[PDB]
Amino acid sequence: CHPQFC
Amino acid sequence: CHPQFC
Amino acid sequence: CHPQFC
Amino acid sequence: CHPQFC
Amino acid sequence: AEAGITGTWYNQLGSTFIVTAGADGALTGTYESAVGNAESRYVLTGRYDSAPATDGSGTALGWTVAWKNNYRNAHSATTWSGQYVGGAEARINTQWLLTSGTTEANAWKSTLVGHDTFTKV
Amino acid sequence: AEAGITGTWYNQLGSTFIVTAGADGALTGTYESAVGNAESRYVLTGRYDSAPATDGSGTALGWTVAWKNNYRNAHSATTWSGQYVGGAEARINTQWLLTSGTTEANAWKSTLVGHDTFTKV
Amino acid sequence: AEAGITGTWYNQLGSTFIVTAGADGALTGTYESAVGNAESRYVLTGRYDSAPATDGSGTALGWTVAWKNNYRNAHSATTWSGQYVGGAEARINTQWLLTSGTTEANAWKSTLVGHDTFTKV
Amino acid sequence: AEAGITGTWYNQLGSTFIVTAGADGALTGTYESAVGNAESRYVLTGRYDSAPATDGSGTALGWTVAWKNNYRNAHSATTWSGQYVGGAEARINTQWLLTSGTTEANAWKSTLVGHDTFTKV
Numbered sequence: 001c002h003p004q005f006c
Numbered sequence: 007c008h009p010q011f012c
Numbered sequence: 013c014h015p016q017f018c
Numbered sequence: 019c020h021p022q023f024c
Numbered sequence: 025a026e027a028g029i030t031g032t033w034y035n036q037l038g039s040t041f042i043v044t045a046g047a048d049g050a051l052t053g054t055y056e057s058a059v060g061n062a063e064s065r066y067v068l069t070g071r072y073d074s075a076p077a078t079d080g081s082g083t084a085l086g087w088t089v090a091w092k093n094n095y096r097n098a099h100s101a102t103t104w105s106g107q108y109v110g111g112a113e114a115r116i117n118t119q120w121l122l123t124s125g126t127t128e129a130n131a132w133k134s135t136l137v138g139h140d141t142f143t144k145v
Numbered sequence: 146a147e148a149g150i151t152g153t154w155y156n157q158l159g160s161t162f163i164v165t166a167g168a169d170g171a172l173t174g175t176y177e178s179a180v181g182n183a184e185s186r187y188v189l190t191g192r193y194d195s196a197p198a199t200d201g202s203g204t205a206l207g208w209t210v211a212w213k214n215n216y217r218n219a220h221s222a223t224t225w226s227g228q229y230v231g232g233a234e235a236r237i238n239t240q241w242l243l244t245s246g247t248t249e250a251n252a253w254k255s256t257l258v259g260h261d262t263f264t265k266v
Numbered sequence: 267a268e269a270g271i272t273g274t275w276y277n278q279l280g281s282t283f284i285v286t287a288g289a290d291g292a293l294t295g296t297y298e299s300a301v302g303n304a305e306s307r308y309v310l311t312g313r314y315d316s317a318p319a320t321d322g323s324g325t326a327l328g329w330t331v332a333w334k335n336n337y338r339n340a341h342s343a344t345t346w347s348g349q350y351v352g353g354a355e356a357r358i359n360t361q362w363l364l365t366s367g368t369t370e371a372n373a374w375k376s377t378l379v380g381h382d383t384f385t386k387v
Numbered sequence: 388a389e390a391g392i393t394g395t396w397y398n399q400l401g402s403t404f405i406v407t408a409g410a411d412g413a414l415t416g417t418y419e420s421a422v423g424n425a426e427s428r429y430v431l432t433g434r435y436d437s438a439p440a441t442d443g444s445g446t447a448l449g450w451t452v453a454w455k456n457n458y459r460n461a462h463s464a465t466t467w468s469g470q471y472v473g474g475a476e477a478r479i480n481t482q483w484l485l486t487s488g489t490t491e492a493n494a495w496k497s498t499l500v501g502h503d504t505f506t507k508v
Contacts, residue, residue, distance in 0.1 A: 003299050003306060003333045003340050004364060005253055005279065009057050009064060009091045009098050010122060011037065011495055015420050015427060015454045015461050016485060017132055017400065021178050021185060021212045021219050022243060023158065023374055049211045050190065069171065069190045071211035073222050073246065081246040082255075086224035088207035090170045090192035101194050103207035103224035105242035105256060109249070119242055119256050119379060121226035121500070125194065125202040128230070134203075135226060135240050137361060137484070137500040139381050240500060242379070258363070258379040258482060260502050291453045292432065311413065311432045313453035315464050315488065323488040324497075328466035330449035332412045332434035343436050345449035345466035347484035347498060351491070361498050363468035363482055367436065367444040370472070376445075377468060377482050 025076050025083035028110040033142035041068060041142065043087075049074040055089045066093050072108070082107030085116070100124040104140065116142045146197050146204035149231040154263035162189060162263065164208075170195040176210045187214050193229070203228030206237070221245040225261065237263045267318050267325035270352040275384035283310060283384065285329075291316040297331045308335050314350070324349030327358070342366040346382065358384045388439050388446035391473040396505035404431060404505065406450075412437040418452045429456050435471070445470030448479070463487040467503065479505045 029045035040060070043053035051070035058064070070087025086105040091098035106118030122136045150166035161181070164174035172191035179185070191208025207226040212219035227239030243257045271287035282302070285295035293312035300306070312329025328347040333340035348360030364378045392408035403423070406416035414433035421427070433450025449468040454461035469481030485499045 002254070002342070002364075003308065003338055004281070004331075004344055006300050006306070008100070008122075008496070009066065009096055010039070010089075010102055012058050012064070014133070014463070014485075015429065015459055016402070016452075016465055018421050018427070020221070020243075020375070021187065021217055022160070022210075022223055024179050024185070049188070049213060051209075067170070067192065069192055070209045070224075071188065071190055071222060073211040073213045073218065073220050075213060075218055076246055077220055080248050081220065082249075082252070084220060084222040084244050084246040085211065086209035086222045086242070086244070088172075088191045088209060088224065088226075090194040090206065092170060092194045092196060097194065097196055099194050099198055099202065099205060101192060101205040101207045101226060103191075103209065103226040103242065105209075105222060105224040105244045107244055107246050107252075107255065117252065119244070119381075121207070121224065121240055121242055123205050123207070123226045123228055123240070125197055125205040125228050127201050128203075131203070131228075131238065132501055133499055134228065135500050136496055137379070137498050138495055139361075240502075253380055254378055256379050257375055258377050258500070259374055260482075291430070291455060293451075309412070309434065311434055312451045312466075313430065313432055313464060315453040315455045315460065315462050317455060317460055318488055319462055322490050323462065324491075324494070326462060326464040326486050326488040327453065328451035328464045328484070328486070330414075330433045330451060330466065330468075332436040332448065334412060334436045334438060339436065339438055341436050341440055341444065341447060343434060343447040343449045343468060345433075345451065345468040345484065347451075347464060347466040347486045349486055349488050349494075349497065359494065361484055361486070363449070363466065363484055365447050365449070365468045365470055365482070367439055367447040367470050369443050370445075373445070373470075373480065376470065 025072060025108055025110065026074060028114060029072060029108050031144060033116060033144065035140045035142050045072055047074065051085060051087050063093055063095050066091060082109045114144060146193060146229055146231065147195060149235060150193060150229050152265060154237060154265065156261045156263050166193055168195065172206060172208050184214055184216050187212060203230045235265060267314060267350055267352065268316060270356060271314060271350050273386060275358060275386065277382045277384050287314055293327060293329050305335055305337050308333060324351045356386060388435060388471055388473065389437060391477060392435060392471050394507060396479060396507065398503045398505050408435055414448060414450050426456055426458050429454060445472045477507060
């Protein structure tokens with residue numbers, strides 16, 4: 001998952 | 007306006 | 013023309 | 019790698 | 025997918041597209057603009073990927089429409105790239121690229137980018 | 146265009162695409178990846194806009210390839226949107242969208258964007 | 267705009283961004299991911315165009331976030347390009363580009379494209 | 388990167404951009420259009436990801452330019468997303484999004500997409 005999302 | 011729209 | 017270009 | 023490439 | 029894709033799809037503006045997804049990944053149909061007059065209809069052709077995975081993934085597909093028919097020549101073409109999600113409320117979510125033919129000096133303004141969501145309702 | 150588009154096109158990586166531009170705006174052919182083995186070949190279908198302008202503008206077109214054939218199923222599709230420029234050194238400049246089928250949680254990483262330039266050489 | 271832009275914005279996933287639009291077109295603030303833990307917070311910097319038109323046009327703007335902070339280094343950056351629309355229900359509609367640093371062989375998969383809509387609610 | 392990014396960069400059209408990459412991921416500078424007259428100069432602000440990996444990966448970054456200065460107000464903004472590659476021939480490869488403020492009826496034509504490559508030469 002990527003910080004832009006989580 | 008363009009056919010994709012109108 | 014747009015400043016990004018000219 | 020993906021077929022679009024390899 | 026395939027059977028699920030075949031049918032009429034509408035986007036948030038009213039545009040309608042009718043496709044037949046054939047056994048071997050072909051997508052054929054027509055796209056119609058708002059107003060819905062006899063021929064605001066253009067031909068669309070695309071492909072979908074016919075043996076999609078079984079984890080609930082969407083079915084990848086894309087199609088192209090050249091904005092030329094017997095009443096209009098907009099000297100442009102649009103390609104939609106996205107995936108089909110089936111179910112109670114199936115939808116196709118896409119991102120599109122609309123390119124107009126320009127001269128080499130105006131090529132910088134030749135491609136617009138946007139997104140569309142299509143539903144059966 | 147049309148006659149000018151028909152033929153073999155190569156991009157900066159080696160990929161090759163062979164198309165037949167038909168009288169009424171259809172584009173049909175195959176795309177082959179690097180290596181160039183028997184079947185790194187996939188079907189492509191697209192459209193081009195067949196009565197382009199006369200100020201030296203490019204011919205708008207687009208095509209789609211679903212990355213599924215008898216040896217591979219990449220569960221994705223790519224659409225190329227761009228224009229054809231004829232002349233001594235004709236080329237097709239495109240921007241592409243590659244979408245992979247994902248689950249609704251991973252839809253954010255489903256579409257990659259890039260560009261390609263194709264020449265006859 | 268300006269005063270109208272300053273504040274907290276939320277997108278359809280829960281991400282929150284807080285910006286201060288300064289007198290001379292600067293945008294400064296922080297972006298926070300889902301969970302909303304102390305530091306899923308990253309710095310954002312952007313610009314907006316401070317003397318927008320008077321026909322109800324939106325205010326063009328954009329900002330960048332490098333996904334590196336004291337707890338995470340995602341070796342990527344995202345840029346959002348869009349416009350702010352004020353009113354009862356103001357919103358900022360954007361299209362974004364997320365690039366990850368790759369090796370030259372993987373540069374083809376380095377940029378993802380998507381869209382986001384932010385509201386005050 | 389950082390030290391490597393700081394300096395003057397030129398793209399295939401002549402545009403020039405001058406940046407200072409600061410210790411903590413900030414990018415500040417100016418972008419100048421063709422002609423190179425006193426003020427075809429606009430402010431740029433961006434971020435880069437300051438602790439990139441060691442496998443030869445590029446350094447992800449992005450920046451924004453609002454096309455407003457004391458001589459022009461183009462009511463638009465551009466965001467460039469890409470990566471910096473250092474070495475003998477360092478370059479920054481980007482994909483950009485240019486959005487113009489439009490009315491809600493013309494929002495469909497508000498964003499153009501393109502790519503740029505910048506070098507030190």
